[PDB]
Amino acid sequence: SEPEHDHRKRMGLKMLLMMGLLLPLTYAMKRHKWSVLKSRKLAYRPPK
Amino acid sequence: TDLTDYLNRHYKAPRMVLAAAGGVEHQQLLDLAQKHLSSVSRVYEEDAVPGLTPCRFTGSEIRHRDDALPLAHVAIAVEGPGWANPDNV
């Protein structure tokens, strides 16, 4: 029923290693570009 | 008191240039500086020479939003080399 079983599991192992590599890296670029804004400080100067 | 302290510790003789341009004579100006500008401070008054540490450049951004003004002024800069670095030219 599954002649592709061993190949599927090998591709799954490569996928697990590959996504374990690239989730933190893409998260790091997202945190870079969004830590532009996540340290933004806003202030108000009404003339009263 | 702080103005007197600033005048004492920042108006010393080796940090002063008397400059003249135009119809002047250097010998007459030197005689006048030896007469009037003699013994300005010459003393640090604490034996503590004030210096200048370097200033860290920061890539950053300030935005003052006030929509009632008719026009907007925007300045964009990078860090420059300094005075003595020749690529200024």
How many helix segments of chain B?
2
Q: Helicity of chain B, in percent?
A: 10-25%
Largest sheet of chain B: none
The geometry of chain B reads as elongated
In DSSP terms, counting alpha (H) and pi (I) runs of 4 or more, how many helices of chain A?
1
Q: How many separate domains make up the residues of chain A?
A: 1
Percentage of residues in helical conformation of chain A: 55-70%
Number of strands of chain A: 0
Q: What gyration radius of chain A follows from the Cα positions, in whole Å? A: 23 Å
Q: From the helix content, strand content and strand pairing of chain A, which structural class follows?
A: mainly alpha
Order of helices and strands of chain A: H
What's the story with the biggest beta sheet of chain A? Answer: none
What share of the residues of chain B does DSSP label as strand, in percent? under 5%
The count of strands of chain B amounts to: 0
* H/E topology pattern of chain B: HH
Structure description:
The structure is cut from a larger assembly and holds chains A (48 residues) and B (89 residues). Chain A is built from 1 helix and no strands. Chain A is mainly α. Chain A has one domain. Chain A starts with a helix and ends in a 13-residue tail after the last helix. In chain A, 0% of the residues are buried. Chain B has 89 residues and is mainly alpha-helical. In chain B, 0% of the residues are buried. The chains hardly touch. It is classed as membrane protein. Keywords: oxidoreductase, complex III. Murine supercomplex CIII2CIV in the assembled locked conformation. Chain A: Cytochrome c1, heme protein, mitochondrial.
